[PDB]
A paper describes a structure:
C-di-GMP is a near-ubiquitous bacterial second messenger responsible for the coordination of a variety of cellular processes and behaviour, including motility, biofilm formation, virulence and cell cycle progression. DGCs catalyse the condensation of two molecules of GTP to yield the twofold symmetric c-di-GMP product. DgcR from Leptospira biflexa is a constitutively dimeric prototype of this class of diguanylate cyclases.
A DgcR variant (R206A/D209A, abbreviated DgcR_AxxA) that had the putative allosteric inhibition site mutated was used to avoid locking the enzyme in a product-inhibited conformation. Crystallisation was performed in presence of 3’-deoxy-GTP (3’dGTP), which is a non-competent substrate analogue due to the absence of the 3’-hydroxyl group. The structure of native DgcR_AxxA (called DgcR’) was solved by molecular replacement to 2.2 Å resolution. Notably, the electron density of the Rec domains is considerably weaker than that of the GGDEF domains, indicating a larger mobility. The GGDEF domains do not obey the twofold symmetry of the Rec domains, but form a relative angle of about 90°. Thus, the two active sites with the bound GTP analogues do not face each other rendering this constellation clearly non-productive. Comparison of the main-chain torsion angles reveals that the relative rotation can be traced back to a 169° change in a single torsion, namely around the Cα–C bond of residue 136 (ψ136). The native Rec dimer with a buried surface area of 980 Å2 is held together by an extended apolar contact of α5 (A117, F120) with α4 (F94, I98), an ionic interaction of D104 with R118, an H-bond between main-chain carbonyl 102 and R124 (both β5-α5 contacts).
Author numbering:
A (entry chain B), B (entry chain A): 6 to 298
Write the structure that this text describes.
Amino acid sequence: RKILIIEDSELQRKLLSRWVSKNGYIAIEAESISVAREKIISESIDVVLLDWELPDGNGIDLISDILSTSPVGWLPIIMVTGHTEPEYFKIAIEAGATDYITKPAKEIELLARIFSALRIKALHDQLRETAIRDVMTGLYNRRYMEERIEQEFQRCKRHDSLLSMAMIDIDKFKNINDTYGHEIGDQVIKQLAHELKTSFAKSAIISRFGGEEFVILFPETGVVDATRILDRVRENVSKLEMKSDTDQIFHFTFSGGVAGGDLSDIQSNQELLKIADKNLYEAKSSGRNQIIS
Amino acid sequence: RKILIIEDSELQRKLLSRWVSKNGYIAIEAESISVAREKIISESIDVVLLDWELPDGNGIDLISDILSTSPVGWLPIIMVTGHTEPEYFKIAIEAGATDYITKPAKEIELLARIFSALRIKALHDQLRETAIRDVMTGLYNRRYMEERIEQEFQRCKRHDSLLSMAMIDIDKFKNINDTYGHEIGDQVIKQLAHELKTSFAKSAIISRFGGEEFVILFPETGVVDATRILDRVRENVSKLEMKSDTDQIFHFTFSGGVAGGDLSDIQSNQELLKIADKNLYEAKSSGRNQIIS
Ligand SMILES: Nc1nc2c(ncn2[C@@H]2O[C@H](COP(=O)(O)OP(=O)(O)OP(=O)(O)O)C[C@H]2O)c(=O)[nH]1
Ligand SMILES: Nc1nc2c(ncn2[C@@H]2O[C@H](COP(=O)(O)OP(=O)(O)OP(=O)(O)O)C[C@H]2O)c(=O)[nH]1
Ligand SMILES: [Mg+2]
Ligand SMILES: [Mg+2]
Ligand SMILES: [Mg+2]
Ligand SMILES: [Mg+2]
Ligand SMILES: [Mg+2]
Ligand SMILES: [Mg+2]
């Protein structure tokens, strides 16, 4: 939905912006690489349009520059250039660009390229989500966890076994990214993952359910025990001295909602997630850094 | 590597062909849709270039026509048209095209579009393969296996062929998870998968049917022979020295039910699953680590 337009020429940049902004998308402008880098760290950009003819140096500078500024680590870059020669397309790909427009760009070429970049990102994402384990944390991904939730709920319901579920979410994680950078944000996510993996019984099933959201099943554990064990981890996390890029100490916290225990009057695993999500929201709404059950 | 070029104009078709054929790819030519359909059924085509201005009918006829002629059921179609209006790009996508060139095509935009179409084909293929597979084991998932059971059963009834089915289930796997952790549980699931994939004839069809349940079809195999082959693997699994997180040795086993062989008095593939499940229960009830047939 969000498109970054990098182009020195004010009239050409505003014309590209109008075309993006007209055809349903949100346009974001940069006149130099300087202001561009601010915008990739600042907002979550879905696609990049890049003038391959900028102030200083060609774009074996630029393309590689844009890619490692990216908080997520990869991003579709569409090249905008007057280089018509087939040779120049290859160098752009080998440099790590996604696509290519010969200027003067037509409304049609521009829409086509953006649609293609977004289709590939979406397919790339659907594929990464079929993986069992999240690469950065080693925890279960969402789709696998959803199959394990359905299975453990069916099993616990048939066997009149206890099953407690927690949904936790880092408190104001965007401010950690904005203030200290995405690399420090990664360290904070992996530190929470480490605490989650080292604190619960082997029997607990731990998922990275979203960017900074974690779902934990506690088979044979009632809501009161699950709450106290999760609250001890919440407490240990609030006391972690994290170090910034420049060695400043900062703290983070998470909020958590716990649902289930006795499943006798919970008809489905979706109802269990609904209750954990409601308790999460109540935790988020009542001062954060707490557990609601 | 192989690109189909559909274009009436002989001069334009040969020019597109030269550009494809020059830049490392193989060019395959069609002057009408008739010749085109012969080429998609005949050879394995990686990408389609399509003239949206052909002899007969518009191109919401053409695009949907090319798609379902495909033996694989999908193909990346790049549109080649004089329709420069933004509106016309959307119609092409909603019709099911992959990409779009405004004629007269430049060598550069043609190569760019083909590169894009090949990245999408590659992701589309990897995804179709995850959709029939259990990602953790590389075996068929349950959804595929139910359809493949129905097909092999109907095939074996047409040919009066033998078809034996085994349903296996890991013995006290919950205690393995609770004692050793879900990571170790997953390694146990993959280790069983490895044994199942390395032990049977090529023609055997192996599925992960559920969390810790696997269904194996043995086409042209009687119950007694399937039982021997399965019991040898049951025995090999019982001997595997699995290692915990802290290098503690443990063993697992599975129980098995074998059904079928002669299908003459089994009216449907469900009756086959029922009998394998009954014999599984008898295996589980009589001390586990055994096969009942
Ligand atoms: N560093 C980093 N940041 C990530 C990652 N995945 C997602 N994020 C970022 O985390 C943020 C998501 O947090 P939000 O859901 O906005 O809420 P929040 O900022 O934590 O606020 P709240 O207190 O309501 O939870 C923005 C998103 O880009 C990741 O892998 N690494
Ligand atoms: N690691 C892991 N374990 C799984 C997975 N799916 C299921 N499980 C485990 O399977 C367990 C099934 O337990 P039960 O149905 O009581 O059967 P069992 O414990 O295997 O005992 P039985 O011998 O009667 O089959 C629950 C869960 O711990 C999975 O994908 N990974
Ligand atoms: Mg410029
Ligand atoms: Mg969140
Ligand atoms: Mg948050
Ligand atoms: Mg023509
Ligand atoms: Mg079972
Ligand atoms: Mg079992």
